[PDB]
Structure formats: structure tokens, C-alpha cells
Structure 1
């Protein structure tokens, strides 16, 4: 139950493929980084994707 707080970016399922095209299930995880940001006007440490943090869109306090 881990997702980006701001965007809801989350892990997705797909395949890991060999050269022989053998298929095994794998996951792609979001680059979630625990950061202190204001939630409900109060600082809170939350998991946020690096993409969301990029361009200083999310303020860290």
C-alpha cells in the first residue's frame, strides 16, 4: 500500500523477458522518496515520487 501522496504514482505489473522470450512476472516500482511536506497545514513525512518533486512543484518543509 505504498503510493506517491501527491500524484498517486504506484507500482505496476508487467513481464521480465529473456532473449528466448521466456516471460516471468515482475513489478515496476515508483521512485518514492520519503519527504517532509505540509499536509493540512502541518508538516508530515510522506512518500512522494521524484517526478512530483521535480521542478519544485511540491514544497518540502
Structure 2
């Protein structure tokens, strides 16, 4: 969800990045099927 932003470095020049979130395989709750899982939740 979102996270697009600049990546200023040293000279403070900007180039766009992504701010990627953590994710992993999971057993799930709603129906026993493998699912992406947000790390901060577990």
C-alpha cells in the first residue's frame, strides 16, 4: 500500500524509489489456503 517517494543522497539530489513492504507465505484464517502475509501483523 503506497510508499512511492524520493531517495535523496548526500548531494540531496532526488530519484524516485518505492519503500517496499515485507511479505511472506501464510496458512491464512478465512479458508485454509496459502496467502501473502504482512509482517507487522504476525
Scaled by the length of structure 2, the TM-score of the pair is: 0.30
Q: Which has the higher contact order (CA 8 A, sep 6+)?
A: 1
Choose between structure 1 and 2: higher strand proportion: 1
Q: How many residues align?
A: 42
Scaled by the length of structure 1, the TM-score of the pair is: 0.25
Contact 1:33 1:49 in 2 (8 A): yes
Over aligned residue pairs, what C-alpha RMSD do you find?
Answer: 5.2
Question: Runs of at least 4 residues of structure 1 off by over 6 A?
Answer: 20-34
Choose between structure 1 and 2: higher helix proportion: 1
Gaps of 5+ in 1: 1-11, 54-61
Gaps of 5+ in 2: none
